[PDB]
Design a binder for this molecule. Structure first.
Ligand SMILES: [Mg+2]
Ligand SMILES: [Mg+2]
Ligand SMILES: [Mg+2]
Ligand SMILES: [Mg+2]
Ligand SMILES: [Mg+2]
Ligand SMILES: [Mg+2]
Ligand SMILES: [Mg+2]
Ligand SMILES: [Mg+2]
Ligand SMILES: [Mg+2]
Ligand SMILES: [Mg+2]
Ligand SMILES: [Mg+2]
Ligand SMILES: [Mg+2]
Ligand SMILES: [Mg+2]
Ligand SMILES: [Mg+2]
Ligand SMILES: [Mg+2]
Lengths: 544, 544, 544
DNA sequence: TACCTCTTGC
DNA sequence: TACCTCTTGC
DNA sequence: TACCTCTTGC
DNA sequence: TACCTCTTGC
DNA sequence: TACCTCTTGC
DNA sequence: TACCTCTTGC
């Protein structure tokens, strides 16, 4: 009906506790979405070329050359923690849960409204009861997957603030070459956009692949419930590194008086100790020598850019680093860095077009400190001679700033690592898996990776509101009545988690409000707000 | 009952042959265990610091800095081949079995006895019928896993020799930095123990996590039967390397008279041969060029130390090397080296605190001979020019002792390798798997890795035998009656194996006693004994 | 049986989660208890008289005069949080529970052992199998209630440290007068111990009121399960004070730019506002004037000593105070202060007979800041004149240090307050209710007050081990064989709690380990330990 | 509209 | 809303 | 034609 | 206590 | 002795 | 272990 409401606005998060410490977390979210008619009603294949920037020989990393199909459709993406949980709820989950399971997700569009503008510069807004809001749900997942969280373009993080969907667009194949160089490179290094391989051309259109529903004012649209199928995510971090795996050496001499300099001593000549090592050469059995079952973490090339058919790209790392050689200042390769606007956590009363940022440094110790790496000749005659060792200080290729660890890789059959932790609230929640024959062991952008089909994407678009003069036979762009729509969106994301118990004698890490952060969880006198990032795997767990 | 025995001493190994060549090997083991009261009744958090040794710039590999919780409990660990099989039995298994499956493990403590000492320096020993022996079985596996085999601290390998458990202790988190250096490094390289990250603090106590049973003289304690769930272990070695995979080249000319210099010849110009290769450049099809399905083995960095949050540690390798470029003298990276005492195989009548050792060199050929590696320019114009090849002889980073193979890594989607072989008798049998999201494909310390829960650890401790003067309100350490206990331990480890059959025309490798080793399997005139290590995968098997 | 164990040592704390967010917390506790034979086998009625101290006219508060029956029995008291929960468990309860219910309590004595000493000064300890340990359980509650927590004399807080019961003794009626005085009081103020009112004489003996069980070595003793019946205890604190109850005044003018000095203003002359007040005189309606439903908290006389038949005593207060006019330095009347030894949380390696202390300052804001109180003439003509107001600065009785608030009392039919919060670990858990006709609304020493019968007290005593020369007909004290006993105690305290949910947008207070407290939850390198007090009602709750 | 969640529901 | 179609339908 | 035997049989 | 294992058992 | 609690129990 | 007895039993 025209003058009837088709739904409920619910942003309540329910915690249903079940037998055996299981909890069914039901996150409800609703937002008022604002949508304008498309720039143009057509699909465009556009190429982006920032040649003048990558032509500065030393600037390869700043390459932006790519091709894309620009569609007249908008994308309603809610894949981001900030859309479902507020700080308070997040605290509860993170402090008391041990593991989190992604169960299901359903969403609907209701209370649709379409208005038109008519214009001394004074506008007037009216309701066009007959105008339609086009909704398309790509359930089959034909359209290429384009998670908005990667560009901080999801829905708003505050329930009492209207939001908007993002103009949908996807990558169109293109070949491109760009040879790396440095400040002093002589000549002009090849840097060109080759074009398109017809054999890889894929031009998709919502119209030809998805049934489109036309919603008028009294219409609503709901997707069914979609059940995820993916590994659980842990809310505990490991701390043990190869150096803390197994039975420690027996201390034959213990300290007899308190102090920070009163150590205990093993008490056996390093070369007369009993035990096992993988060094068939020496009889030295030290903590750095003793054999460990496998290897926690791995070393990978840092700030390595590889290039294939379409240009260079950063080689991704699984884990960050951090610790007492750390702490958002040294924050090197591996630690994700989120940049975002006012809709997703930046002080809303802040002016200027500079985003808010943060580098997420996980509590899990599975990274590497290259400065501490080194390689020595197999003969293992120590103290090691300069010619018999390769340090992170010895230059590679005559370059003063590149050492071996920079191109080093220790991934292998003995590598053990953990999946990335949830980044509240700017992080992505679930992600689609690659359609390659051999798949990656994890993704660095989300903890949940649908093994099957991921929920299909939801597209919206304001139907063309034609005037009385329309001539399709003409070359000029069609003139439409300025129309826009505002509709309500409601989602329900359901997780299942397990409550934790206390196994150590000591208490553990817990997120808490205090005198220093207190003002990050309350509005200002102007009504300003912000959502500060929070770590997720606070409690520790044994790794072995 | 006080004057009644609660068990049987059985160290018999049963071989039950079943239909279809399957055998149920039941290894029974019993030992008389001796246990003294703890140093102190308290738990201590101790730090070990051998700064003065790692401060010798060239000595990083000798680092021992670590923290550990020292408990008053002792650990009864029987995870080591030497505890269950004698040479004779091992021979049978190794010579006639093809694969070995770890089935179950159960153990019990019986005939408990507690005595007290009382003291011209003449001691007197009495039975304290009321004194108790505390037994705790961490079935849930809350305590961190600390397999004693890694430090040769399991139970004794001879059934007729009393043994003892080891003082239990586990790693306590700590941060620590140590920058590598060499003899001629100028200045003082950072080498410090930072402390502890509260976020990773885990102080466990037997008392707060495991129910403790108090056993008096007439008491016994038995664990139930525990069934393992892990991949089978093979008792055959592969010998084929990439060079021996598939159809050999057809010899167009065969030799016509015996001799070691009368070879056959392929008989087709190397560049006129038919076949397949992954080198799109040349038409050369040689044995080192012809395409093989995948790659057996992989190259990894040798004598590489990586470092994370707690110090440096050796990067582990999956396989050893060996062969005609071998044989316990060159014995380089990958080959495990065991050091051990008299309880585990060293001549028992030997004096001195120097351990017995051996580097285990597996019969499987899946290693690498770096000296034979090399890399050449893609243009493949040969004979190759010096500037177009990188040999294991060309220095990397200006270091005379470091070549590319030293930092090289060829692990990849085409890598194929085998799990580590059993090392009798000093090797560990089963091992717990890491509690990381992505797990290692194997462990280098044991053939069996419980996919589920590994049998929980068994802890023992002599209950405090207080005197009449005890004041808990005091700071001084409590004085106890010198008490100790001797109890009998009996275990039953069950495997299932498959008998082998003869498929080749030639006979194969078999372990056998002869004129040279004969005296390693018999006691001396003094009653000395020893247990010499033995190889396990004697017979060969096709790999492809 | 003599050589058989009669029990299990269990100090595990189980958390059983049920449907609807309820949790059944089962705290198990076991300790090795050490017990010496009594000083004397007789009951003594002793009077304590510290006349010489209270005779210093200004020292009344230091009075210790009292009479007591000294029994040869010892009391095994486990009524104290520290006996049942370690820091880790306490953290879990306090951070995630909303309310706590005391359900049941059962305990047993097992593995009894009796030894005798025999004596160059060298002692020898033997087992006297026939000697008995007397156990008496006053289930009917005939003996006067004497909770040991009040004098920090409960069982030990660490499961791995033997403990001891306390010599039982109870108050014997006595009359006594002591007139207060001050430094300059002239003459000698009456200060005397009158004696005993026969009409109030109550001499109780364990022997005549409780059946006593004789336990020899192979004996055990268990009480049944006892179910408590008392109000639940909340784990949330209220923060609202009369000034924050109800609908705030409507701000007619809001701030327009961020800042800590940009306030909003009500915007209506204080005497032209609409609303309700209990001041029939004026038309002023201010925040301190507007009528509130009732009164949170109450004002009581501070450092008031009252005196009845047996001497002076401090008038107890229900709530503390604290806040930004606070914080363990100003910590005045109402805030409990615990003093204790090494058995209950003081650094165990600390020497000296000085106790460890702390003043518990509750998170609940229900106290008073006298400095802010005042009283003014009913005519309410302001600004108030000196003669028309009585400030906390105006002297009462010509005394410079006493003001009206000192003798002030605002308890009344409109008073609302909360029960005392749990003080971990030194606080008492449950308490017996007074057998008076009109009972107190709460106790200040414990959150749980059994409405019915509280669990009866458990007494122990070493039976007389006579020598061959005993003549009861003699006046001399009987000579006994030096005997002592060590027995194991195990208890099970069960609570039921409700899990909390997140209702605010902001996160809340949570106990957590950090860089500053980290070392309070881990043993030292000497094996030192300590248990630091923790607050219990961290989360806030609405009061109205 | 039920005692700061779903749920005075099941 | 199911794994680029209709169709995780029949 | 079944995972180097008979036997992916019985 | 059975013919050098479990097993003159099942 | 089951996958850091009770509980691979019910 | 039940509300200072036996008896929160009968
Ligand atoms: Mg469909
Ligand atoms: Mg092509
Ligand atoms: Mg850390
Ligand atoms: Mg169990
Ligand atoms: Mg930290
Ligand atoms: Mg070979
Ligand atoms: Mg009774
Ligand atoms: Mg009288
Ligand atoms: Mg406050
Ligand atoms: Mg409700
Ligand atoms: Mg389909
Ligand atoms: Mg076959
Ligand atoms: Mg037989
Ligand atoms: Mg369990
Ligand atoms: Mg009674």
């Amino acid at each position: 009906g025209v003058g009837i409401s088709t739904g409920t606005f619910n942003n309540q998060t329910e915690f249903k506790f079940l037998e055996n410490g299981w909890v069914e977390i039901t996150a409800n979210s609703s937002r008022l979405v604002h949508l304008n008619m498309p720039e143009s009603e057509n699909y465009r294949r556009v190429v982006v070329n920032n040649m003048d920037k990558t032509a500065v020989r030393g600037n390869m990393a700043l390459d932006d050359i790519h091709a894309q199909i620009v569609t007249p459709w908008s994308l309603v993406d809610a894949n981001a923690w900030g859309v479902w949980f507020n700080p308070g709820d997040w605290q509860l989950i993170v402090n008391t849960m041990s593991e989190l399971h992604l169960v299901s997700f359903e969403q609907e569009i209701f209370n649709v409204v379409l208005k038109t503008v008519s214009e001394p510069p004074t506008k007037v807004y009216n309701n066009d009861l007959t105008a339609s809001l086009m909704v398309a749900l790509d359930s089959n997942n034909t359209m290429p997957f384009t998670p908005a969280a990667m560009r901080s373009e999801t829905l708003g993080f505050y329930p009492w603030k209207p939001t908007i969907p993002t103009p949908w667009r996807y990558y169109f194949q293109w070949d491109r070459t760009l040879i790396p160089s440095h400040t002093g490179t002589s000549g002009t290094p090849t840097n060109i956009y080759h074009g398109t391989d017809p054999d890889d051309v894929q031009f998709y259109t919502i119209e030809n692949s998805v049934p489109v529903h036309l919603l008028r004012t009294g219409d609503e649209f709901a997707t069914g419930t979609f059940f995820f199928d993916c590994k659980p995510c842990r809310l505990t971090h490991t701390w043990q590194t190869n150096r803390a795996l197994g039975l420690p050496p027996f201390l034959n001499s213990l300290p007899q008086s308190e102090g920070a300099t009163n150590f205990g001593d093993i008490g056996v000549q390093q070369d007369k100790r009993r035990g096992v090592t993988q060094m068939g050469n020496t009889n030295y059995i030290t903590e750095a020598t003793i054999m460990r079952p496998a290897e926690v973490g791995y070393s990978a090339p840092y700030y390595s850019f590889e290039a294939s058919t379409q240009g260079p790209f950063k080689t991704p790392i699984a884990a960050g680093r951090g610790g007492a050689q750390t702490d958002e200042n040294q924050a090197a390769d591996g630690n994700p860095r989120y940049a975002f606007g006012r809709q997703h956590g930046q002080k809303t009363t802040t002016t200027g077009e500079t985003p808010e940022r943060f580098t997420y440094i996980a509590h899990q110790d599975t990274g590497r400190y290259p400065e501490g790496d080194w390689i020595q000749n197999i003969n293992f005659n120590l103290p090691v001679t300069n010619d018999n060792v390769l340090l992170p200080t010895d230059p590679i290729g005559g370059k003063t700033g590149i050492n071996y660890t920079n191109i080093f890789n220790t991934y292998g059959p003995l590598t053990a690592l953990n999946n990335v932790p949830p980044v509240y609230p700017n992080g992505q929640i679930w992600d689609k898996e690659f359609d390659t024959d051999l798949k990656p062991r994890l993704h660095v952008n989300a903890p949940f990776v649908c093994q099957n089909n991921c929920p299909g994407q939801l597209f919206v678009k304001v139907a063309p509101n034609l005037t009385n003069e329309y001539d399709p036979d003409a070359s000029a762009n069609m003139s439409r009545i300025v129309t826009y729509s505002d509709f309500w969106w409601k989602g329900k994301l359901v997780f299942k988690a397990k409550l934790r118990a206390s196994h150590t004698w000591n208490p553990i890490q817990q997120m808490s409000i205090n005198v220093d952060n207190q003002f990050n969880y309350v509005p200002s006198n102007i009504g300003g707000m912000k959502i500060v990032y929070e770590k997720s795997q606070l409690a520790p767990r044994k790794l072995y």
